[PDB]
């Protein structure tokens, strides 16, 4: 199971201003973020 809102919150909470977006990739929470 994967949840968009839950994933977004998780990804946003950990990732700082480098956080792009968050979503469900396949069936797993995927966090998008840049390095530099």
Determination technique for this entry: NMR
Both tokens assigned to 32? 């998008």
- DSSP annotation of 4 reads H
**Burial (CB count within 10 angstroms: exposed 0-12, middle 13-18, buried 19+), residue 22:** buried
Domain ranges in the chain are 4-33
Name the DSSP class of 26. Answer: T
Q: What are phi and psi of 3, to 5 degrees?
A: -125, 130
What radius of gyration do the chain's Cα atoms show? 9
34-to-1, 15, 18 alpha-carbon distances in Å? 26, 9, 5
């Amino acid at each position: 199971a994967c949840n968009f809102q839950s994933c977004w919150a998780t990804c946003q909470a950990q990732h700082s201003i480098y956080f792009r977006r968050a979503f469900c990739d396949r069936s797993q929470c995927k966090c998008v973020f840049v390095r530099g």
